[PDB]
Amino acid sequence: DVPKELMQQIENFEKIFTVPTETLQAVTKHFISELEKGLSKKGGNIPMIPGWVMDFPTGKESGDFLAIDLGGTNLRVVLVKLGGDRTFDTTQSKYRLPDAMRTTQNPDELWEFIADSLKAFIDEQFPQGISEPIPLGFTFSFPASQNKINEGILQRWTKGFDIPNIENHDVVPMLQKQITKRNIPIEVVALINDTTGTLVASYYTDPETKMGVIFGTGVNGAYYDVCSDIEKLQGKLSDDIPPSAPMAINCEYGSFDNEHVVLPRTKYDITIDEESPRPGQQTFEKMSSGYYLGEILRLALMDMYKQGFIFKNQDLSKFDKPFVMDTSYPARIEEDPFENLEDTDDLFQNEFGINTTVQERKLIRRLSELIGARAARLSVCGIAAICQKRGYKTGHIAADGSVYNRYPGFKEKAANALKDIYGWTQTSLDDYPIKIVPAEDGSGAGAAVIAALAQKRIAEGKSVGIIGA
């Protein structure tokens, strides 16, 4: 179809958004230095946080463990029954978080709500009551600091929360105090980030697990390093931790390349960064998360409109507004099945009142493929850098997040990007030596499995954090 003028614009967009193999290998190479710098005494833009998990699950842990996940809307409560055979059973209940609870002015209140919901859960699940205490792990996916598995210092509220006297305090005793007040025999023994549970719960059912990874609104990965290779813990680990012990690391690598030395940032990426809540931060997350792809698309289209190629004589009042297109716009455009791109045509007409021609839809579609492919390719550089740092030649990468699970074609493109990085020659994704597979649940199962490892150490008197606490 496409006229010559549009065809030249599509070829300019191919040059802006294509990230060839050599760029991927240079990004990856710089990413491995940054991982190592984050583990050093001096530190770096990647935090590389010790997760205080110092054991690999054997797959034979068994018994009843609880996990709670404090989310945006709901408090989720999970009873996890470890089978002792690399399998587990879960039972969950969701307790919607009152509108007014997120912003209470009584700091005890939230902990009372969590303990009351625990009480109702336990009532349904253990009708004859419970005699010996059940270990609990708390997925607290707000910005926090820890020096041992069973503390959690809030650094700053997020997602609308705004409760006084909690920032800079340990939240574990606040929750434990309300549990003990109601006489529930539950012990809080672990506080984790959901990415570090993703790793640990997938390892329990699949011992080829080399990493846990999230491809969602936020991006993150966790893996096991080795305590002798972590310079910043030198002299902070008591003698009951062997030098070769494993140490789970929560990278928090969304800040990779805040120095702007390797990522292929375009004019559109600079504009996204400048219009965001925090310009200069979360650089790798802005370059690789699915959350920005409709806004990238939007800006490229606004450029074409302005330069007189498309949307001639249309009213753009509804379209010309930042973040009017979320991730599901490009996703739907990529899924449009037929050649004349009828779903895309309905979308632009119904949402924005814009009538397009077929040729305009082929440029929109081709733009949406280029942008979803770039985000998939860049998002695996952190996987490759960890496997190359640690020398994993084979293994499974446990993945989760809404982009990984739902964005069209993200899984094939992420796998093929690994292939390019490594120069593999196999031709089916199933024979690749490093495979991306569906993760187990990190918020639920993962916190419970971590609670099972911490409680065994605590019981034996072994260290669960640095000398001091």
From Swiss-Prot:
GO molecular function, one term: hexokinase activity
Keywords: Allosteric enzyme, ATP-binding, Glycolysis, Kinase, Nucleotide-binding, Phosphoprotein, Transferase
EC number: 2.7.1.1
Hexokinase domain span: 4-452
Binding-site residues for substrate, renumbered to this chain: S141, T158, K159, N193, D194, N220, E252, E285
Name this polypeptide is given: Hexokinase-2
Residues reported in the UniProt entry to bind ATP: 69-74, 94, 290-291, 327-331, 402-406
Recorded catalytic activity of this chain's protein: a D-hexose + ATP = a D-hexose 6-phosphate + ADP + H(+); D-fructose + ATP = D-fructose 6-phosphate + ADP + H(+); D-glucose + ATP = D-glucose 6-phosphate + ADP + H(+)
Subunit structure, interactors included: Homodimer.
Biological or metabolic pathway of the protein: Carbohydrate metabolism; hexose metabolism; Carbohydrate degradation; glycolysis; D-glyceraldehyde 3-phosphate and glycerone phosphate from D-glucose: step 1/4
Note: In yeast there are three glucose-phosphorylating isoenzymes, designated hexokinase I, II and glucokinase.
